[PDB]
Amino acid sequence: ESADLRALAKHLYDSYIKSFPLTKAKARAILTGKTDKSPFVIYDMNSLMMGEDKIKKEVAIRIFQGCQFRSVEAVQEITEYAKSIPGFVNLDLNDQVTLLKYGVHEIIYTMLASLMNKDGVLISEGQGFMTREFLKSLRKPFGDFMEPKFEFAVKFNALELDDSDLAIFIAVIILSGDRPGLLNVKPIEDIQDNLLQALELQLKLNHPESSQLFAKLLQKMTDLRQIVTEHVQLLQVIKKTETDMSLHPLLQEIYKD
Amino acid sequence: ESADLRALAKHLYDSYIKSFPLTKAKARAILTGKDKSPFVIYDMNSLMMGEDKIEVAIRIFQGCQFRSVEAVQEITEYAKSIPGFVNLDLNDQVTLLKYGVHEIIYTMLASLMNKDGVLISEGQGFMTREFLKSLRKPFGDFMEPKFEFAVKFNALELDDSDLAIFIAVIILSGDRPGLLNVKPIEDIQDNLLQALELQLKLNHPESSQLFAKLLQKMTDLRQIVTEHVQLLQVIKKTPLLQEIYK
Numbered sequence: 265e266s267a268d269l270r271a272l273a274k275h276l277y278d279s280y281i282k283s284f285p286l287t288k289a290k291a292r293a294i295l296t297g298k299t300d301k302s303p304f305v306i307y308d309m310n311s312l313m314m315g316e317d318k319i320k321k322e323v324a325i326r327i328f329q330g331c332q333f334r335s336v337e338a339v340q341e342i343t344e345y346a347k348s349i350p351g352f353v354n355l356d357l358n359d360q361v362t363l364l365k366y367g368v369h370e371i372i373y374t375m376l377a378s379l380m381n382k383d384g385v386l387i388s389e390g391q392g393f394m395t396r397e398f399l400k401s402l403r404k405p406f407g408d409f410m411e412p413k414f415e416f417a418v419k420f421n422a423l424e425l426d427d428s429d430l431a432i433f434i435a436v437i438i439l440s441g442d443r444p445g446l447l448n449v450k451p452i453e454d455i456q457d458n459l460l461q462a463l464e465l466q467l468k469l470n471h472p473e474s475s476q477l478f479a480k481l482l483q484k485m486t487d488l489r490q491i492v493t494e495h496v497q498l499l500q501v502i503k504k505t506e507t508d509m510s511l512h513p514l515l516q517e518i519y520k521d
Numbered sequence: 522e523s524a525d526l527r528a529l530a531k532h533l534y535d536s537y538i539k540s541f542p543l544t545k546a547k548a549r550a551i552l553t554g555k556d557k558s559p560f561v562i563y564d565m566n567s568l569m570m571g572e573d574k575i576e577v578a579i580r581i582f583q584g585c586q587f588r589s590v591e592a593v594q595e596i597t598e599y600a601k602s603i604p605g606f607v608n609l610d611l612n613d614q615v616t617l618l619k620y621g622v623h624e625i626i627y628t629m630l631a632s633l634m635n636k637d638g639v640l641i642s643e644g645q646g647f648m649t650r651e652f653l654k655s656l657r658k659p660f661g662d663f664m665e666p667k668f669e670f671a672v673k674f675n676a677l678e679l680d681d682s683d684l685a686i687f688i689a690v691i692i693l694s695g696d697r698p699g700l701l702n703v704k705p706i707e708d709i710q711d712n713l714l715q716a717l718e719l720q721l722k723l724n725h726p727e728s729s730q731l732f733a734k735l736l737q738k739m740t741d742l743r744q745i746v747t748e749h750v751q752l753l754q755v756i757k758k759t760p761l762l763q764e765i766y767k
């Protein structure tokens with residue numbers, strides 16, 4: 265029944281609004297220019313030093329440390345959203361942990377696209393905007409932590425998904441029965457099946473002119489997994505080069521693999 | 522009129538049956554008898570065996586924590602079936618769930634308790650009151666005030682039809698801190714209260730002032746919750762898992 269799929273799409277959207285304070289709709293209105301919501305822009309070291317006045321160690325390290333703290337808050341938001349996905353909490357506790365461990369970063373890069381356009385990224389709940397050029401201009405190896413995220417984002421954003429869409433897509437990501445170390449693959453796959461059915465109808469209803477959008481979205485999961493693995497490789501470099509740099513426990517446990 | 526009140530009661534009963542896998546009726550049958558006996562946990566070896574069938578004290582309290590999170594999702598779903606709830610301001614919904622869940626967890630837990638112990642694992646097991654109370658401090662004191670609450674609550678002899686409305690009344694509390702629009706909430710709760718009153722008059726004609734007696738139990742519930750939070754602050758003085766439970 266179509267109607268049970270619609271109801272589940274509605275529930276997931278509602279949870280998504282409750283779990284994530286900065287939605288794509290809000291991010292786009294800020295980026296577009298929809299007076300009231302105008303961000304301060306950080307394109308250089310002086311603008312960055314100014315940003316601390318009107319927005320909420322070393323500069324490159326201060327920035328990277330900021331991202332990692334933000335990434336932790338995002339993991340908490342994603343974690344709260346996951347608990348809302350029907351069946352998730354009823355799964356074996358080790359599998360819940362495993363789904364989260366492999367899922368959360370893919371979800372982070374998916375939603376981070378919402379806060380990006382080709383020249384920059386929203387920061388600090390959208391009060392600030394840090395330019396893409398400025399992030400590139402960071403001393404090695406920090407120069408190119410964000411670049412693969414921009415490249416993914418520009419392309420992902422051409423799909424034109426809205427938040428209702430994304431709510432379902434991120435649920436589909438989390439409930440992937442091919443995560444390494446899963447004890448009970450079957451219960452997970454049965455939930456994903458249902459979520460995939462919900463996503464399929466949603467995209468057909470919400471984007472009736474956009475052909476094979478469902479398949480086009482699913483193929484993007486290939487791009488997400490690539491971004492994760494490259495980011496891990498970059499993180500291994502940093503720890504060795506910046507022996508004075510402190511990585512957040514949560515994030516360390518996630519990356520253990 | 523009275524028929525809108527019956528419509529609402531029935532709507533809530535049907536949703537409560539859909540949302541909660543283990544009903545009071547089903548739990549009473551298993552506690553009195555009616556088919557496999559639940560596996561009983563009365564001792565340490567019993568527990569050890571129970572895990573295979575289906576610090577000990579820490580592992581038991583973590584288990585109640587995991588179940589509590591399951592119950593939050595069941596309660597959340599049920600709340601969405603209450604007429605008016607989804608039309609409320611989003612922040613207010615989250616606020617009503619945030620403060621309402623604990624009161625409901627303990628209300629429904631009474632359903633699974635008698636004076637001698639509590640059903641666990643969806644009624645596949647029975648953990649004895651004595652075994653819970655034997656647990657080293659401060660764990661031994663955690664379940665006991667719930668049992669005390671439950672013996673008195675259960676004396677009202679509510680069924681699932683009654684409880685379904687009562688639960689909704691608890692969710693639509695206008696006095697939760699942080700609420701943005703208290704009006705439509707109180708307005709829904711007034712209507713839920715009307716349904717609860719007529720439900721109790723029809724379902725229990727002989728039980729005088731059962732409605733008032735039930736509302737007085739809200740004092741007992743909030744005290745339990747406040748007392749739980751207190752013991753939880755004490756427990757904090759002793760990774761991805763931490764996050765899930767929060």
Ligand SMILES: CC/C=C\C/C=C\C/C=C\C/C=C\C/C=C\CC#CC(=O)CCCC(=O)O
Binds near residue numbers: 386388
């Ligand atoms: C004042 C703003 C606070 C923190 C962000 C500041 C600069 C970061 C610049 C761009 C990033 C945009 C938003 C922040 C959130 C995620 C971006 C990141 C990403 C990753 O590279 C993951 C980093 C987590 C880690 O440190 O491992």
Ligand SMILES: CC/C=C\C/C=C\C/C=C\C/C=C\C/C=C\CC#CC(=O)CCCC(=O)O
Binds near residue numbers: 332373375
């Ligand atoms: C102060 C931290 C600096 C920058 C980001 C601050 C807030 C991000 C804005 C809103 C967050 C709330 C809900 C939206 C959820 C996900 C979209 C996102 C995001 C990010 O902020 C990027 C984090 C991604 C990463 O760490 O890679």
Ligand SMILES: CC/C=C\C/C=C\C/C=C\C/C=C\C/C=C\CC#CC(=O)CCCC(=O)O
Binds near residue numbers: 585
């Ligand atoms: C070990 C995780 C708990 C349960 C397994 C999942 C579903 C079985 C359904 C109910 C079992 C309930 C509790 C078993 C664990 C600890 C006992 C404690 C307490 C409670 O029994 C749960 C109270 C929540 C509620 O039913 O409202």
